[PDB]
């Protein structure tokens, strides 16, 4: 199975944010890890997940995992515009929602 990673996509499967898309910022182990989108998570509130909890996306995001690499800590608003940068790609598939 994939291993989490840095700055990768998830949509949340079961949670407070249920459905929800979020970065993982990061890996205890391929079990537990945390998240934050920037928004309704912020990082200093970032969440322990099982994941479990969580569906792995094939998307992720260079510029957190640089500001990880380089500081070992990545702003809200990066985050947001990783998540951005998700949603730009599949605007199709979610134009509809409500
Ligand atoms: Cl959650």
Known sequence: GPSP?????????????????SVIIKRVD???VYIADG??????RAKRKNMN???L???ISPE??????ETGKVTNGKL???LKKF??????????GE
């Open 39 to 44: 928004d309704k998570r912020k990082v200093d």
């Open 80 to 82: 947001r515009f990783a």
């Open 5 to 21: 990673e840095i700055g990768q996509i998830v949509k949340i499967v079961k949670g407070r944010d249920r459905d929800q898309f």
């Open 87 to 96: 949603l730009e790609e599949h605007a199709d598939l979610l134009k509809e």
């Open 57 to 59: 996306i094939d998307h």
């Open 53 to 55: 909890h969580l569906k």
């Open 64 to 69: 957190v995992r640089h500001s990880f690499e």
């Open 30 to 32: 391929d079990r537990f």
